[PDB]
Structure 1
């Protein structure tokens, strides 16, 4: 359609050239399939969506910006919703744009699951069935990995929580 246009006469000459017409379409389709695969690899890291715990207590950590808002339409978190405004994309003549295998809405759910998974189960969810852990306790493990002892987090959790909240 692009090269020859609507006219039949133009089409005949294109046939003479070969499988160039056919080959170019195949390459684009391969590219189109790849996009879905990339998104699939990046976000389908979790077997099962994990609903966020009803209790919002997280040992003084405020996660309101990061987590999805039920009142708001499209289940996009405040940080996420702000981001969409920042980047804005804004058929015609033989060129067609195909919609993503994963709808923006679906992508939102995947992100929430990881967020929900990380807070509720630590790193346990990555390697198997998610294991419930106290958030303060999870943070304690994190300090140990980086060489600051767990007691240190517990001694001034409040100071740490405020900095984290302020940072977010």
Structure 2
């Protein structure tokens, strides 16, 4: 589990929305606080819900390591021993994977810097404005609740008996 250095001199980029915010009681960043607010979510008849093994705070600690490693080390930490490379050369390698020569980045370092930062800001606005952005997750939670709720409703059905109350017929 890697952790980011305190310094944030990442060549004009800021990863503020994705880097964890220490201020919150849980070490969550700006973006995934929006998501946790968007979603909408023991019983009498045996129906119990068991807690997950990984507590919700534990997962957010993993994603920091997956994110801290990829912003300072490249692809090495996934396939070997972690090695450090400055972020300015991290982008240069990616362009070689596109087929464009590496000189273009160092020639226009400001333009890519501004476009990346501006693009990240839009995601926060786009997610937080339209309510249908999270339809896929919202389908899972609603589907589970509906089926389970119908099961309880079934106890009131007569099934062709005289009364749906078990003690009443007895």
Query: TM-score, normalised on structure 1?
Result: 0.69
2:148 paired residue number: none
Task: Measure how far apart 1:58 and its partner are.
Answer: 0.7
- Asked whether 1:100 is paired with 2:52, we answer yes
Which residue is 1:110 aligned to? 62
What is the distance in 1 between the residues matched to 2:72 and 2:40? 33
Q: Normalising by the residue count of structure 2, what TM-score does the alignment of the two structures yield? A: 0.68
In 2, the alpha carbon distance for the partners of 1:128 and 1:88 equals: 41
Measured in 2, the distance between the counterparts of 1:88 and 1:50 equals 32
1:75 to 27, 47, 57: 27
SS of residue in 2 equivalent to 1:55: coil
CA RMSD of aligned residues (A): 0.8
- The match for 1:148 is 100
Post-superposition offset of 1:94: 0.5
For 1:84, the equivalent position in structure 2 comes to 36
Q: Which runs of 5+ in 2 are unaligned?
A: 121-170
Matched residue count: 119
In structure 1, stretches of 5+ residues that fail to align are 1-48
Bigger helix share: 1
Q: Classify the secondary structure of the residue corresponding to 2:46.
A: coil
Q: What are the within-5 Å matches in structure 2 for residues 1-168 of structure 1? A: 49-89=1-41, 91-92=42-43, 93-168=45-120
